[model samples]
Target chain A: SMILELDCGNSLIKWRVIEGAARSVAGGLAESDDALVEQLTSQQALPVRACRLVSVRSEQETSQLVARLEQLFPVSALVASSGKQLAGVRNGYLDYQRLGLDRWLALVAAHHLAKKACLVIDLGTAVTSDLVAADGVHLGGYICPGMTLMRSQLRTHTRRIRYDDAEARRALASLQPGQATAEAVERGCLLMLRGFVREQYAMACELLGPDCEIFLTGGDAELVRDELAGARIMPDLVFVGLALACPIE
Target chain B: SMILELDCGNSLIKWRVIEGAARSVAGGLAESDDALVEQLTSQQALPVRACRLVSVRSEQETSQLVARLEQLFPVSALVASSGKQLAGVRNGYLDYQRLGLDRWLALVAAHHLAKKACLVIDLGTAVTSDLVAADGVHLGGYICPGMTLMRSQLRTHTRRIRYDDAEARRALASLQPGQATAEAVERGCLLMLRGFVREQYAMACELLGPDCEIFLTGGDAELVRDELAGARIMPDLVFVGLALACPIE
Candidate 1:
């Protein structure tokens, strides 16, 4: 029998099915915008024994996702959230329940992978930087609006500044000040984010000495990957966390 | 003979009428949300010889403001925007016309006050930071969503994180992870802005040495003023800039 794991995000869901010993048979992506339950229910499932899910979406959306997965799997699905301490990583949340499930699992995976003090960054709906000490102590993290949030705010606040994906895409081309409206907004957001990440990197280095490692993940992982120094990109770290959270049996 | 100086901001209009020596005899503020023309037109005016205005509102709103002021004043209003070089300072914008009028005039005011390298920050609809060298070279600065923008976006983005000004105000109480949703969102936006400002401070110091002065202005000027180092709070920097831009005869 196989175990299926689902990582539900703001707009997309990533899933994997696994057997014993970290050997997985299948993995795929699903759009949350469509009829999620109908699509998943129609798909042929193996003799999957258990289904596990981690979500940052609203309770309503998460339920929709879990309902669909439950209909497809043989057993009742398990929904997971942050615990006080889990998988050898100690969270900094005074009340661990306040911590996000996606962030919590990502820390667990990073602690195991880094094996030392490290900076774990998630660049999805929000940009989060969690510092996991070499001794597995989660020293909390920093959270801020992601690029999309910044873009949306700029469009609404400024009269002339507007969003154009093509213009935003051109922002990383150079380091000069923008001469146009779109470029100005894009470059401004990019510069602010880069500075934010760089500052965090410096602080992490200061706290962990020169031995701290940095790992980057999430939807826009590649956007600032080149600008950051020594940041290892992992677009699927959330899924990696899911695999670690639910053990193969 | 007198002069009417208008400061049209994102949410309100500040006006002062002076007869001589930049001494405003009567001044009042009007809500931008209401009937702006009717509000100002009903107010008494001196034998005003000329009218001057600086606006950060939309072009359509600016035009409306101009049309109303034209009906009230005897002379056409002299609108101001940043130029490549003006009032003893040189801007970095290759296309000087693209610079926001709000930032341009604020720099003029801060430069004369500091008479040296200075960092000017406006905390209104957006947080704008501009670095002006001692000799008046406007080194381009940074911009990001202000607290209001962040607060608005959070409410729309997350169902759990709704707007609670009381909880938002308590964010700076401690540095540990927030135990509630509103606190978390508030803390996140504050931390991001503080980091952005600090990063800009460091860059300015590197380029212009530690002697550079810091000036804070705008509607939300008090929010992050306490968080910055050596920042002098000036609630009327824009108005002061207006005084300098349009020299009184």
Candidate 2:
């Protein structure tokens, strides 16, 4: 029997099926709850036995989504919950429960994988960086606008700085200050992200010593992948921790 | 006699009275054209001569504002226009005319003041940073979201990351990873800005040698004042450039 695991983030719902502890049988992404179910239903022959998920949505929304999933999948479901400690990583938020679960899972995954002081940087709708001690004590993190929000905010707020998608795609050919609107905005935001990665690396070096492992993940992870040398770009970091948080028994 | 110089930015119209070429008599910020007229009406006792302005608004809007100002003050108004070279600084944009008037004036001001390789960073509704060479050659620049957009983007995009005015005010006491929602979001955005400044400084050092002058101006310049050492935090930097661009005859 296989188990289904999902990471429901602000932008997308990523789901995967595993036959044993962490051996992936299949995986895909969907835009919403119904979309996730519709996507999973296409692979109904996978013999999935149980469902486990993590969400950043409201409690009521999560509960309703889980109930809907249970009814559709015809199996018991477990929602990943934060605690004082989980999967060997301690929550570092002043209010442990207030920490974002996606961040928590990423920390757990990074700490477990690195087995040393590590920084987990997720560049999705929001760019988040969490510092975890070698002993798995989460030392909190910072959250800021990611590339999407950075670009959107500029375009939405500024009256004259406008561009098309094709222009944006072409503007990234060089990192030098933009020659046009698209180039200026696209490359400028990219530099901002690179700066963020550099600052986080500097802080990691000072706070966690010279050998802290850096884990990079998220949809826009590739945008700044080259910014940090030796950064482990894991596309499924939160999912890796998802399995740890809600282990299949 | 005095000249009225206005910097029409996205969020505000900053107007100042100048004696001779650059001596400031009085100045203030206004939200709109009408508001600016109303505010200046209170100070009509000054012996006003003519009006000059720099605007980032659309050409039609800028024209309308200047015409309105001309009628109200009954003085000739000259709108600042970009050129191939001005105030010993050459324009760097591929199409120099497309560059924002406010940015062009800032570059002119920074180059003239530094008389050396320099970077101008303006933090307003949007944050813009431009690089100029020792020979006053504009090497283009970057525009990114400032503190306002960085904070607003996070709140508007992420459903759960919400806070209020009072909560935001108290969150800036420290730079630690936020312990709560407000602290996390507020401090996080601040770090992002600090990161941007650090990167720009690093780039300046690498490109223009170790002694490059950094001129920081903007509504939120003070937020990252301590991040860089010996940076000239001139609140009136753009205005300084405005004087040079629209010099009194």
Candidate 3:
């Protein structure tokens, strides 16, 4: 039997399949609920025993996804939720329910992995930085526009600046000030995220002292890994917390 | 006689009327070109001799504005253009003409005001930072989404995060990680801009030494003013450069 783990963002759904012992068997991205179902069924694997997931999508969309998964698979679906306390980590949000599950899961995973004060910075569709103290006390986090959003914001808001993703990718090779429109905008946003990371690290040092461990996750986490000194890049942080939150047992 | 100076951004037109000797006689913001003309004509001032303007708008829109003003006010409009050199400041962009006039003007104004190494930061619809050497050589710059664009990006991209302007204004009281969504998103973007400013300052100090002068301008300049030490906030830096670029002989 296999368990399907899903992480739904604003744009896409990332999924992985793990056996009963929790070793991953297969995984890929899906653009929609139907696509996810199609992809999972097309693969030759053990029967899906259970499905666990976290989503930042709207309530209706999340419900639709849940209902669709349940209809196709015999296993009951478990949605990871934000709460006041979870797996030795406390939620810092004034309203724990309002905290994003993705953020909560990442922080929870960070706390458990580091077993000390940890700063979890996730750079994906949006850049989020969450802090977990050494004593399992959660310090609230910050949210900023990630590269995709920042790039889109620049393209949509400004009239003269125009460039394609090809140019933007090449522009990220350097952190120096840009010479052209694409380089300037791409590098500029990249610097903004780096600055966010630096400020969070500074604040973490001031609040949590000098020993706090920093964890970088999400798709764009690699972009900022060099910006952070002695930082660990964990691509599966959310999934680690997801398995912890939505246990198969 | 008065000279009309206009700085057109993505959303609003910032206008100031100056007397023959460059003293600002009157100034205000306008939503449109028609509103601008009405405001200028309604004011009791010396007859307008020439209109000096800088526009980030499209070529057609800019041309239309110039033609309309020339036809109605009997004054030829002199739109500020980005160039390789202006007011002893060299343009850093590889394609100088492609640079935004507003950014160029701010850097030009900064070089003249500091008469030394300087970093000019504009925090409006889009945040831009330009570096100038003490010898007036341009070192290029970076551009990122300003508060407005960042806020809108989070609001539009994420399904869960939502807030009003009032709450956003209240949330920026401190830079602590937000307890609520509004506080998180608002303070997050604010920190992003602050980080951008901080990075620019760090870079400026590294390249231009400790004596580098920092200038902050634009509508949201005050938001990040406290983040930078010894940074001067000059609201009319662009207009100052405009006068130099389009001087009335």
Candidate 4:
């Protein structure tokens, strides 16, 4: 028997299967159509048996893909929007019904793991920062364009500025003046992200009265973690929360 | 002879002529066009001989527009990025040259009229706030995306949210619960703007040692002014500065 766990993020669709306690099969990334499940399966040795789908987006193609999975394996559950009532996490949003389930799951996972007031920041295609209290209450969060989007905006809106994320990373890493277009883009992107995180930290400190743990996740989480003073990286927080949602047979 | 003063702002271009001590010509507004002078000859019955074009922008279209204006009106003086010479305004930036010339001009205009420590906020395509000292020193300023852009970003990126400036205005207008879409937008937009302003005001108050005057300008200036408790509006501050730059011969 296979227990598949899906984590549909803004950047990519990732999945893992728990065959037993410490033994598990994982590592699948679908960035585009060419890397869909069929292509992913061709490279894998195990046969697909059961799967779960978690996503923020509602697309026809995604639905069709889910249907195809149902044909090959049993569909256990589909988690999208967080309706309410996370066993461990508290939803403080005025409209809890409208909150993204994936984000809620991530918050719950962080709250359970951290067990203290924490700033859970996800650096994906977009960056999100949430303040979760010790009592498992999610106060609120801020959403901003990610590093890639920021660079893309500059490139598309302004002339003479080309795509160079690598150059930007090099400049940021060196801590020197961003002289070239790529350096400038990188510096500007980092500054914007850092500024935003700092602002959110300040706000959280004021509202939550300081002394909160900071947790980082998502693809670019590690990239920005160094800039965040004392933030801990928890890459599997979302997956852990998804696992918690499932009942033991 | 009437002197036509035009301030080509980020959102709108406004032009008005002063005929005498207590009289003025009807003002005209164009949709933020720097090529406004080209249509001046055909659109209105203003005396071209007495018409003077006072152009200003926040470095939106720098090279082409400035050069074209210089070619067309050789006598027109382009405002320099004055650092500390301007009265009642302070330069808080690490490098004064990096600041926008229009922002400095606006500060100068406000300082010339108030002659005291003042908080000058420009609400246009972007929202900017600066603290000016009584001695004409520009302390520093903060910049953020305008209400429209803020709302647009939310609408474009988020799933359920729609582009609603009116809703945002309503939210900013009051602290009441954001019930409707417009109210939520208004509240969210206002929260971001007011939060920045509040932070700036507190910083300015600390730096200026209390008793600082607050003046608002730009397109959305009125909207923000309505919400601010102790702020005053200076509609023609930019124009006043432009007029001061070139006194009638």
Candidate 5:
């Protein structure tokens, strides 16, 4: 028996197949529609007993995509709700239904892997910093407009500020002393990120009391992780959770 | 004896006349271009005994406009420089030359009116809060983007947020307990004003101890004044400074 898991994240779609506890096979990346189709089809060679997809898509798209996937693999399942079933992860907010399912799933995935009070920082198109306790208690989160949006806003709104990629990189590197125009932009961006991170850390410290394990994920995880001095980078934690949700043969 | 005073601000130009230090004889507002021409011609009738023109332009647009006004009113005398001969107004920066002349002039006017250590809050397109000691020292100030720019940025940059003045007002007035969007825009704008006020108040409390007066001016002074609980609003403080700059017949 085989279990297939798919995570359609903001920046990329990741998938894996687990056969029993000791054997597993996984790898895929696609940016466009045609490429995604090719990637999904290529992964169809694995003999699968059941399949599940966790994605950040509208209800209509989710249904349509699920229907399309069902044509290829008869055992495909769509994970749509922002709730935990048998998973140890707990939803903290009263309005858990309103929270993004991808965020919830990611938090659960992080908790399952860490089994410790964790601050999960997902740096996608938008940066989300979520907290989860060792006991799988979801502790809410903060969302901020991503790096691209911040840089775009500064460049587009202010006259005489040309869009420079190097300037952005330099700005993010040195958060403390920003002197020139580019440095100011970079420093401002870094300050915003730092503020969010600090706020999350403070909140985690208040709730979990000082020793919360910090986890970073998503396509931008590496870029942000380097800035954060002692963060644990968990590249495939979400996929791990998705695989955990399915039965292994 | 009569005197006509011309003030060219960031958004508009205004001119008015006073007869014998008691009454406003003739006053009108015009486009900066029309007002400049009107000012030059109107002065011909005013005193005949002594003629003086006091002009103040926004800090950002001062240099070019000052040069043009200086050429036109060379004999009329220009007191654009702050703290030169002005009584009760001290230029406060380490490098006095760096302070914006418009802000300096306004503080001078406030000093003359209050005759006490005062916090000067100016609400124009951009709102500024400055502190002035009774003996004419300009404590440093804080500047924030004005309401119009803030509203415009929200509309242009954020998805689904529209540029509506009424909507902005509603949002500001009805900010919920923990509403992120409403709190962000409203608190962000108010924070800039409050931060300056609080900073000046704290500084004034340290310097002047207990009885430092707070004065508010500028285009949006009324808006800020409403938000501030116990602040005094002085509408024409800058104009009063302009009047004090020149000798009265």
Candidate 6:
């Protein structure tokens, strides 16, 4: 029996298939929900025994996705959101339902892997940074627009200082003073990201002590890996949370 | 005779009419340029001997105000932009003209007041943090959206986590674990603002050492003042910059 774990985000939806004793992970991505199954099928993937799908997308898209999943699979998968003390980790939010699924799952995954007070930073279309205590207590987190979201704002409406992700990455690699508009933009966006991460780290240290590990994940994680100190990269963290989430039932 | 200094910002135009030897300032606000004259005239104000009109607005709006001023006053005012060096401080941008006139003026004012290595932060529709070296050379700066810009983003589409500014500020003043959607948004935005400012101070320290001061100015400075330590406030920085500049020739 195979288990399907899906992470639905604003820009892309990523899925991982878990099967067998070793629990080898396979994944796929797509722009839309219906296309996600098609995208995964191209990998010659068969049906799954169970499934868990997590989303930070609109309700309509999320509902449409569930319907599509039910049509495809005999077993209906559970959609996950934060609850009171589920899977050992506690919700930091005042209202458990208020926490974004992506953040809650990411925290769960970070706790399982690190098993200590840590700063779990997920950088993608948006950046979510959660501060978890030594014993699975979430001390709340913050959400801000990711590089892509901020980049559009950074791009002056005028023709100058505009750059794409590729250019942003290239300019960031050098980490020099931006001589041109393109470089300035990429550098500035990066500065904000790094600044935010560092500030969170400072606050986390005050509450969780100075030695808690910092786990970095999500699509843009690689872009910011080198900019931060002591940030360990953890790919597929939300999926990891799915596997640990009591089968999402 | 009066020195009329107008700060043309994104939403509202704030005009200060300086009269008498002590440069007593009488200020007024207007949403549209045409209404600006009416706001000033309400104080029974007449013509001015000099003027400095700095705008980060539409070229048309800026020109319209200037035309109105030319019709009303005998002199054409000096519009400010960053030059290679001004008032014992140097422009850091490769293209000095590219620096927003507002930021340029803020730095000019900051240098005059602090006269040391300092980080000058302006918070409002957008937040600009410029680092000036002790020797009066602008090392560089970063620009990101302020609370107003970020607040729109902080407004979650989800029913559980969305709130407006009045609601946000109310929540922020309390700064508790957000039980309602209104509180979550307000806390999140405040977190980002504090993080960005703290991070900039750290970066500023690395370049300018521990002794360099941090100066806070702009529309939202008061909102964030208590969040930081040892931050000096200069309420009318741009106008101060105007006074220091070469008589707006």
TM-score of each: 0.78, 0.90, 0.93, 0.64, 0.51, 0.83
Quote model 1's TM-score.
Answer: 0.78
Better of 3 and 6 by DockQ: 3
Taken over the whole model, the C-alpha lDDT of each candidate is 0.73, 0.84, 0.86, 0.60, 0.59, 0.73
Query: For model 5, how does the per-residue alpha-carbon lDDT over A118-154 read when each residue is reduced to its tens digit?
Result: 8887765555666787788876664444455455655
Interface Cα RMSD for all candidates? 3.0, 1.5, 1.1, 6.7, 7.6, 3.4
Put down candidate 3 lDDT per residue, B103-196, tens digits, no spaces.
9998999999889999889998888988899999988888998888887888888768777779988998888878899988887888888888
- The residue-level lDDT of candidate 2 at B227 comes to 78
Candidate 6 residue-wise lDDT, A66-96, digit = tens: 8888778776778876577767798887778
Write model 6 residue lDDT over B1-249, tens digit each, in one string: 777788887667878877753265678768776687677667544657777778877677678888887766666677765588888888888777777777778887787778899888888766777888888988877766676665565464222346556766677775433445565455555666776777677777788898998899977898778866699887788778777763743
Local error of candidate 2 at A34, Å? 5.9
The candidate scoring highest on lDDT is 3
Task: List DockQ, one per candidate, in order.
Answer: 0.35, 0.65, 0.77, 0.10, 0.07, 0.29
- Candidate 6: TM-score? 0.83
lDDT per residue, candidate 1, B1-249, as tens digits?
A: 878888887756878787675677776777763555555566555677778889878778889878877777786787776667777988766667777777888887899888999988887767777778899988766567777787787767654455467767777685443455555566666666666666667776887788999999877777677767579898778877777666555
| lDDT value, residue A39 of candidate 4 | 48
Task: Give the range where candidate 2 chain B is weakest over 10 consecutive residues by summed lDDT.
Answer: B175-184
Write the residue-wise lDDT of candidate 4 on B1-249 in tens digits. 445556654455676657763156666767745446655545446542343334334354644455544454333534444454554455555555555555667777887877887878777655556667777766655444555555555567556455355544445555332334444444535444555555556566777756888888876776656546778787776666665555556
Chain A only: TM-score per candidate: 0.84, 0.93, 0.93, 0.86, 0.76, 0.88
Return the candidate ranking by DockQ, descending: 3, 2, 1, 6, 4, 5
Q: In CAPRI terms, where does candidate 1 land?
A: acceptable
Can you tell me which runs of candidate 5 are displaced by over 4 Å?
Answer: A1-5, A9-29, A38-50, A68-77, A84-86, A156-160, A164-173, A176-182, A226-230, A245-249, B1-249
Native contacts retained by candidate 2:
0.69
Candidate 2 C-alpha lDDT tens digits along B9-85: 88789988888877888989898988988898887568778888889988898989988888777588888887889
RMSD for each of the candidates: 4.7, 2.7, 2.2, 6.9, 10.2, 3.8
